[PDB]
Write a structure and sequence with these properties.
Strand content of chain A: 15-25%
Pfam family, one (chain A): Abhydrolase_1
GO molecular function, one term (chain A): haloacetate dehalogenase activity
CATH class of chain A: Alpha Beta
Bound molecules: calcium ion
Helix content of chain A: 40-55%
EC number (chain A): 3.8.1.3
CATH architecture of chain A: 3-Layer(aba) Sandwich
Number of helices of chain A: 14
Protein name (chain A): Fluoroacetate dehalogenase
Strand order of the largest sheet of chain A: 1-2-4-3-5-6-7-8
Largest interface: A-B, 26 and 25 residues
Largest sheet of chain A: 8 strands, mixed
Organism (chain A): Rhodopseudomonas palustris (strain ATCC BAA-98 / CGA009)
Order of helices and strands of chain A: EEEHEHEHEHHHHHHHHEHEHH
Radius of gyration of chain A: 17 Å
CATH topology of chain A: Rossmann fold
Oligomer: homodimer
Distance between the termini of chain A: 36 Å
Chain lengths: ~300, ~300
């Protein structure tokens, strides 16, 4: 597997819940980048060097993803709730001396990110979320069209071992299909093939796939519950935040993203990028530039 | 290898313009067509058909593309697996037997064929029984987190091919057994005859049979929904006397009664809960049989 972060260090950050793997590069204020599904930290390989000019970039595999340890799940999928993941990543950052940092997340990592921002806002200077709405918003807008478009939210949330058994027949197909279907182009062309190899290899592990289901099960249950409490209490993110979404991505299909985030964040700016779901790989120049400007403010 | 679960029933291959319908046929009296759903075959009626055969000519048909029925070639709109097309084919199948006015009971997908038939060609039906469904439109209109999680397979199997086909091929035996177990009241296969499960397992083992089921659900998400929507908006109601049976632990139930929802679709509908999960004729065969004979006798 290729090193897509030449000159970046590599850290195994030990936490109470297992090791976080991270590539580390650049200098300046600490910036944590979190990938999503079905990816690993290497999805940032096109924009992390450009951020590394101005920030200490920490490119972490999510708890349970990539090369991070997989905490053993439980009946409530607790370690793979965004709340628990946020906690583990806060722990990881503290091991590096980062108790106050900037954070950008995409997909699942963006959900960890806004949940981190709601649970422990004092940990964040600024927050960027890439192509998501809050988990609560997806479920609340889950009508016919949206249930078809993001079917995997209900399918991967099905009780073990049903998704795992189906995914295990041909893991390569599913990871490649999920990658392809949410690009603007509808194929794998936006991706560096060495990055695809990373995604494909991570997905080839049955326990890694279980973890991803656990993450989606948390997303259907505890994640939704945590979010529901916040939205019904009027708890807003107080960290300055950037919401970037793809014009052909997931967030914009059932809502106007900036309108939704103004319900969740007291201080949010947003910008569409011409892109599918995978903003940092489909549109790396426009994404890196959006993140450099926001975090330099 | 595959047990004969309808002793005394014969076996018909009914020709239609879109391929053969397989049916087990028994009894005498007014014609009664029994339609199975997903992921079963006609054999799901094996505990209730003998009871109905005391008073009806019972035709126990494999849905087009299911079981041993032929699989008509699908197209971009999944047209032969829309409930409208399936109903036209079964109307044609019944005509081959001289049945132009018949009683109809369907479960699951076959229940969807059945109420669509009732809507499109009500004159063909003496009475209609639907087991453990609401109309397709109602499921989709009620699509929320809870339902999306409970009937996930409606959006999963409706994904463009070959995605659900490929994943179903990952472990087809587990999938059909999981689908059967998870919708029973017990949560295992204990309510099913092991010989019937073999039929379901063997039908589900053919990739082309699984593809058709996916076509059925693709139609369930698109054309079937649009056909239902037109009837909603035009105020068209099923005029034939209708029985709506649902499992107390089935898919149709939730918070609002299936009966109140069927009253928006049917002029003349009675309804009863059966202590059962989704698979009323196998989980509650006596309670289902008696409700059906009671209703179809009138
Ligand atoms: Ca298996």
């Amino acid at each position: 597997l290729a090193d897509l972060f030449p000159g970046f260090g590599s850290e195994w950050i030990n936490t109470s819940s297992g090791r976080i793997f991270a590539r580390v590069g650049g200098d300046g204020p600490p910036l944590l980048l979190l990938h999503g599904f079905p990816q690993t930290h290497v999805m940032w390989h096109r924009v992390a060097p450009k951020l590394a000019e101005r920030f200490k970039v920490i490119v972490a595999d999510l708890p349970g993803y990539g090369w991070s340890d997989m905490p053993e799940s439980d009946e409530q999928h607790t370690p793979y709730t965004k709340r628990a993941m946020a906690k583990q990543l806060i722990e990881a950052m503290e091991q590096l001396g980062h108790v106050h940092f900037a954070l950008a997340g995409h997909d699942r990592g963006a959900r960890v990110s806004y949940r981190l921002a709601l649970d422990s806002p004092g940990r964040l200077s600024k927050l960027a979320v890439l192509d998501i709405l809050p988990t609560y918003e997806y479920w609340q807008r889950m009508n016919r069209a949206y249930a078809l478009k993001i079917y995997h939210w209900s399918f991967l949330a099905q009780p073990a071992p049903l998704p795992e058994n189906l995914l295990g027949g041909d893991p390569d197909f599913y990871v490649k299909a999920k990658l392809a279907s949410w690009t603007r182009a509808g194929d794998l062309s936006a991706f560096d093939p060495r990055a695809v190899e990373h995604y494909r290899i991570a997905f080839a592990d049955p326990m890694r796939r279980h973890v991803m289901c656990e993450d989606y099960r948390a997303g259907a249950y505890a994640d939704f519950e945590h979010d529901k409490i916040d939205v019904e209490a009027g708890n807003k993110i107080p960290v300055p935040m950037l919401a970037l979404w793809g014009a052909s991505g997931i967030a914009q299909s059932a809502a106007t993203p900036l309108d939704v985030w103004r319900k969740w964040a007291s201080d949010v700016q947003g910008a569409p990028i011409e892109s599918g779901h995978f903003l940092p790989e489909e549109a790396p120049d426009q994404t890196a530039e959006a993140l450099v400007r926001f975090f330099s403010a």
